[PDB]
Scaffold this motif. Structure first.
Motif, PDB file in Angstrom:
ATOM      1  N   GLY A   1      -7.922  16.269   7.981  1.00  0.00           N
ATOM      2  CA  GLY A   1      -7.708  14.929   7.457  1.00  0.00           C
ATOM      3  C   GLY A   1      -8.873  14.396   6.637  1.00  0.00           C
ATOM      4  O   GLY A   1     -10.039  14.732   6.890  1.00  0.00           O
ATOM      5  N   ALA A   2      -8.561  13.575   5.640  1.00  0.00           N
ATOM      6  CA  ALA A   2      -9.593  12.991   4.788  1.00  0.00           C
ATOM      7  C   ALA A   2      -9.287  11.532   4.454  1.00  0.00           C
ATOM      8  O   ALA A   2      -8.135  11.087   4.575  1.00  0.00           O
ATOM      9  CB  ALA A   2      -9.726  13.793   3.508  1.00  0.00           C
ATOM     10  N   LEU A   3     -10.321  10.791   4.047  1.00  0.00           N
ATOM     11  CA  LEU A   3     -10.147   9.397   3.669  1.00  0.00           C
ATOM     12  C   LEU A   3     -10.449   9.263   2.186  1.00  0.00           C
ATOM     13  O   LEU A   3     -11.403   9.859   1.691  1.00  0.00           O
ATOM     14  CB  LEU A   3     -11.101   8.472   4.431  1.00  0.00           C
ATOM     15  CG  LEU A   3     -11.044   8.517   5.959  1.00  0.00           C
ATOM     16  CD1 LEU A   3     -11.922   7.413   6.528  1.00  0.00           C
ATOM     17  CD2 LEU A   3      -9.596   8.354   6.428  1.00  0.00           C
ATOM     18  N   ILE A   4      -9.625   8.482   1.493  1.00  0.00           N
ATOM     19  CA  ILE A   4      -9.792   8.213   0.073  1.00  0.00           C
ATOM     20  C   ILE A   4     -10.040   6.704  -0.048  1.00  0.00           C
ATOM     21  O   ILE A   4      -9.209   5.901   0.384  1.00  0.00           O
ATOM     22  CB  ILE A   4      -8.522   8.572  -0.737  1.00  0.00           C
ATOM     23  CG1 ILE A   4      -8.263  10.087  -0.701  1.00  0.00           C
ATOM     24  CG2 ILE A   4      -8.715   8.195  -2.220  1.00  0.00           C
ATOM     25  CD1 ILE A   4      -7.865  10.637   0.642  1.00  0.00           C
ATOM     26  N   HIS A   5     -11.185   6.327  -0.614  1.00  0.00           N
ATOM     27  CA  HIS A   5     -11.539   4.913  -0.804  1.00  0.00           C
ATOM     28  C   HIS A   5     -11.730   4.648  -2.297  1.00  0.00           C
ATOM     29  O   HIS A   5     -12.358   5.450  -2.986  1.00  0.00           O
ATOM     30  CB  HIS A   5     -12.861   4.578  -0.103  1.00  0.00           C
ATOM     31  CG  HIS A   5     -12.786   4.579   1.392  1.00  0.00           C
ATOM     32  ND1 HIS A   5     -12.498   3.444   2.124  1.00  0.00           N
ATOM     33  CD2 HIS A   5     -13.021   5.561   2.296  1.00  0.00           C
ATOM     34  CE1 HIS A   5     -12.566   3.726   3.414  1.00  0.00           C
ATOM     35  NE2 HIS A   5     -12.882   5.004   3.545  1.00  0.00           N
ATOM     36  N   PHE A   6     -11.189   3.542  -2.800  1.00  0.00           N
ATOM     37  CA  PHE A   6     -11.353   3.213  -4.217  1.00  0.00           C
ATOM     38  C   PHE A   6     -11.159   1.720  -4.430  1.00  0.00           C
ATOM     39  O   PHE A   6     -10.696   1.004  -3.530  1.00  0.00           O
ATOM     40  CB  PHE A   6     -10.369   3.997  -5.094  1.00  0.00           C
ATOM     41  CG  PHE A   6      -8.920   3.719  -4.795  1.00  0.00           C
ATOM     42  CD1 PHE A   6      -8.172   2.876  -5.621  1.00  0.00           C
ATOM     43  CD2 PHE A   6      -8.291   4.329  -3.711  1.00  0.00           C
ATOM     44  CE1 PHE A   6      -6.805   2.647  -5.374  1.00  0.00           C
ATOM     45  CE2 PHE A   6      -6.936   4.113  -3.453  1.00  0.00           C
ATOM     46  CZ  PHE A   6      -6.185   3.261  -4.297  1.00  0.00           C
ATOM     47  N   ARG A   7     -11.521   1.258  -5.621  1.00  0.00           N
ATOM     48  CA  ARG A   7     -11.399  -0.143  -5.948  1.00  0.00           C
ATOM     49  C   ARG A   7     -10.448  -0.227  -7.130  1.00  0.00           C
ATOM     50  O   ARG A   7     -10.544   0.532  -8.066  1.00  0.00           O
ATOM     51  CB  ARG A   7     -12.770  -0.748  -6.285  1.00  0.00           C
ATOM     52  CG  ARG A   7     -12.745  -2.285  -6.341  1.00  0.00           C
ATOM     53  CD  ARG A   7     -14.134  -2.849  -6.631  1.00  0.00           C
ATOM     54  NE  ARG A   7     -14.195  -4.317  -6.708  1.00  0.00           N
ATOM     55  CZ  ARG A   7     -14.069  -5.136  -5.672  1.00  0.00           C
ATOM     56  NH1 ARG A   7     -13.842  -4.647  -4.462  1.00  0.00           N
ATOM     57  NH2 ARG A   7     -14.158  -6.452  -5.848  1.00  0.00           N
ATOM     58  N   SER A   8      -9.522  -1.161  -7.058  1.00  0.00           N
ATOM     59  CA  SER A   8      -8.509  -1.308  -8.074  1.00  0.00           C
ATOM     60  C   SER A   8      -8.173  -2.784  -8.280  1.00  0.00           C
ATOM     61  O   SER A   8      -8.444  -3.642  -7.426  1.00  0.00           O
ATOM     62  CB  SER A   8      -7.280  -0.506  -7.624  1.00  0.00           C
ATOM     63  OG  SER A   8      -6.090  -1.069  -8.110  1.00  0.00           O
ATOM     64  N   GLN A   9      -7.594  -3.079  -9.433  1.00  0.00           N
ATOM     65  CA  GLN A   9      -7.219  -4.447  -9.760  1.00  0.00           C
ATOM     66  C   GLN A   9      -5.702  -4.601  -9.728  1.00  0.00           C
ATOM     67  O   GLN A   9      -4.969  -3.766 -10.272  1.00  0.00           O
ATOM     68  CB  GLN A   9      -7.724  -4.829 -11.159  1.00  0.00           C
ATOM     69  CG  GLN A   9      -7.410  -6.290 -11.534  1.00  0.00           C
ATOM     70  CD  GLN A   9      -7.877  -6.690 -12.930  1.00  0.00           C
ATOM     71  OE1 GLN A   9      -8.230  -7.856 -13.164  1.00  0.00           O
ATOM     72  NE2 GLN A   9      -7.883  -5.744 -13.855  1.00  0.00           N
ATOM     73  N   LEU A  10      -5.248  -5.668  -9.074  1.00  0.00           N
ATOM     74  CA  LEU A  10      -3.828  -5.994  -8.998  1.00  0.00           C
ATOM     75  C   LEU A  10      -3.442  -6.429 -10.411  1.00  0.00           C
ATOM     76  O   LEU A  10      -3.972  -7.416 -10.912  1.00  0.00           O
ATOM     77  CB  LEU A  10      -3.595  -7.163  -8.027  1.00  0.00           C
ATOM     78  CG  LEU A  10      -2.128  -7.614  -7.896  1.00  0.00           C
ATOM     79  CD1 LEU A  10      -1.230  -6.412  -7.580  1.00  0.00           C
ATOM     80  CD2 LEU A  10      -2.022  -8.649  -6.805  1.00  0.00           C
ATOM     81  N   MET A  11      -2.532  -5.699 -11.043  1.00  0.00           N
ATOM     82  CA  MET A  11      -2.111  -6.002 -12.413  1.00  0.00           C
ATOM     83  C   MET A  11      -0.784  -6.770 -12.540  1.00  0.00           C
ATOM     84  O   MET A  11      -0.679  -7.691 -13.348  1.00  0.00           O
ATOM     85  CB  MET A  11      -2.014  -4.705 -13.211  1.00  0.00           C
ATOM     86  CG  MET A  11      -3.277  -3.841 -13.158  1.00  0.00           C
ATOM     87  SD  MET A  11      -4.750  -4.765 -13.636  1.00  0.00           S
ATOM     88  CE  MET A  11      -4.339  -5.161 -15.353  1.00  0.00           C
ATOM     89  N   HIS A  12       0.233  -6.387 -11.772  1.00  0.00           N
ATOM     90  CA  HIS A  12       1.524  -7.079 -11.845  1.00  0.00           C
ATOM     91  C   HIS A  12       2.223  -7.029 -10.511  1.00  0.00           C
ATOM     92  O   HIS A  12       1.974  -6.133  -9.703  1.00  0.00           O
ATOM     93  CB  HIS A  12       2.453  -6.408 -12.850  1.00  0.00           C
ATOM     94  CG  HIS A  12       1.786  -6.058 -14.136  1.00  0.00           C
ATOM     95  ND1 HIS A  12       1.560  -6.982 -15.129  1.00  0.00           N
ATOM     96  CD2 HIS A  12       1.233  -4.897 -14.563  1.00  0.00           C
ATOM     97  CE1 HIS A  12       0.891  -6.410 -16.114  1.00  0.00           C
ATOM     98  NE2 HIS A  12       0.679  -5.145 -15.794  1.00  0.00           N
TER      99      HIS A  12
END
Lengths: 227, 227
Positions: free
Chosen positions: A82-93
């Motif tokens: 198992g692995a964890l994926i972390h990221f930052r994103s902007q709510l667009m619509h």
């Protein structure tokens, strides 16, 4: 135990199963913290990350889920340990029709925490596996700086966890010559009457020869190849 | 070699990787047939299957991609030897914004073409694996009419492909007694210093004790359980 690194989003998201749960962590301009969870739907090319619109209240939507807000997202992968994926994103619509969905930006990279400390490069290089003075056929399938994956004809000699072997991989397409040997111990194996696959962990010398071999290979976009 | 069965759509689609290619076949009432391919994005709960709009002419969209039109679809699964998923869906909506997407219906069931000929049910029942009078600890992890998967503690004796063993699964929560033995041949194994898993194929009587064991089990929505 876990190694964390920066990976391009395409490869990062390919580790995530569609329909799995995403954890969205939001911090508003005044610093108000909010967390919600919702299923990952998928991605349209590299343009948007689609998620099921979470069932939050009207106040929640008003104060915490505005188009334009940036947020931290966590995704899980069930591969291996198992692995964890972390990221930052902007709510667009946010679309309510034909079904409730939120569209988030896809950043160029994401942080992945996984058990493998380094990448393994795919390839298909024929060679021989030396063990106890005897040689068998093998085909190298992936190679990293610290180890490799190889397969053998399922009816040939088999190896056990811990066995010390040396892989002599053909340097030319004529067989004959071989790159300096990849020495190491069998770390894992998967076998049946149809397949025989092995994961090997190199020793010092093996690491040296792996680096040497890797350097003599040319990339062809997806795999490494002789050259 | 490939067995076909009808599976609920949630399970069938779980086998398909997001972003993989779908093959859409459409036949109009006058018999004109059109085939195109496009990437699978994902699904919103069980309401819609989302795909990227296929890159086709106004001509082709007009005659073959109208809301309301039905189409037969083929998806791929990379698991194990690989599998094919076939299903029939109706084009429900075409969206242009914020990205071009087509929303298809999700039928209740789908046809899966895979190598396994029957399903395997998950569970966790402790027991012993008997071989040459010796008994090693084990845990049954899946069970089918023809075989089962079991694991042992990592330091346990290791079995080789072809070995004839007998699984004595505890019938009560206090060890003591066990279900009639699940006898068979080790078909496959995956091993390392930290894991030891085995796939087993039952012999004739073993198949009988598997049916008899199963029937004595209580279902709990996701997996089976004792008592």
């Amino acid at each position: 135990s876990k190694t964390v690194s920066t990976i391009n989003s395409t490869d990062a998201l390919a580790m995530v199963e569609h329909s799995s749960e995403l954890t969205l962590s939001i911090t508003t301009p005044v610093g108000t913290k909010f967390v919600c969870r919702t299923p990952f739907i998928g991605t349209h090319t590299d343009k948007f990350l689609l998620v099921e619109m979470p069932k939050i209240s009207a106040d929640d939507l008003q104060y915490f889920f505005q188009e334009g807000f940036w947020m931290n997202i966590r995704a899980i992968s069930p591969r291996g340990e198992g692995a964890l994926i972390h990221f930052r994103s902007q709510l667009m619509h946010i679309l309510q029709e034909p079904v409730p969905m939120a569209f988030l930006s896809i950043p160029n990279t994401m942080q992945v925490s996984q058990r493998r400390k380094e990448p393994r490069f795919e390839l298909n290089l024929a060679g021989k596996v030396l063990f106890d003075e005897h040689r068998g056929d093998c085909e190298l399938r992936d190679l990293s700086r610290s180890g490799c994956r190889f397969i053998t004809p399922p009816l040939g000699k088999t190896y056990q966890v811990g066995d010390l072997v040396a892989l002599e991989i053909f340097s030319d397409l004529r067989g004959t010559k071989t790159f300096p040997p990849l020495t190491g111990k069998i770390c894992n194996l998967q076998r049946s009457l149809h397949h025989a696959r092995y994961g090997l962990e190199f020793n010092e010398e093996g690491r040296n020869n792996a680096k040497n071999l890797l350097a003599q290979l040319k990339f062809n976009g997806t795999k490494l190849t002789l050259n």
